[PDB]
Symmetry: C2
Subunit: 97 residues, 2 copies
């Protein structure tokens, strides 16, 4: 099933963890990677709408992003693939001149 | 000279006109084109900072964008090249299936 259809506690938890992740592997980098590596396409405007969530008392840009990716077809295993690609590309970029 | 060093009345006027342009040839499309066609690179975060300008009483996202492009080296003639490329690509996309 797609991320936006995940049980709502689990999706909450995913979004909290991604919200706490460092800049190099945060929701913006996740959007960057999913918007270039798959047929899933995000514009700057979508990212903006998610970014504004932080203005709500306990708002989550990662919750917005994950739901949007799910609506665009992303599944849990696809998200996991994306996150480990994030890890690999981060360390490869650190080691690159 | 660069856009951010233009006389400040002229830069005002450029930004007002771009702010009034339609969606197909607006400041977001200008950023899109300049961020892919030249070595000038804008992130979604820069565009976000410009987008937030509209929250100021008479604020201008195009003013922010044009200054940022100038700081990154864009000249007046380069901006004109970008704007006419905007026109051409818009009409080519309308005529494309």
């Amino acid at each position: 099933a797609t991320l936006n259809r995940l049980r709502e506690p689990l999706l909450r938890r995913l979004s909290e963890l991604l919200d706490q992740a460092p800049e190099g592997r945060g929701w913006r980098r996740l959007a960057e990677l999913a918007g270039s590596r798959g047929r899933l396409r995000l514009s700057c405007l979508d990212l903006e709408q998610c970014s504004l969530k932080v203005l709500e008392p306990e708002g989550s840009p990662s919750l917005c992003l994950l739901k949007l990716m799910g609506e665009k077809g992303c599944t849990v295993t696809e998200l996991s693939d994306f996150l480990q690609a994030m890890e690999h590309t981060e360390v490869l970029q650190l080691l690159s001149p």
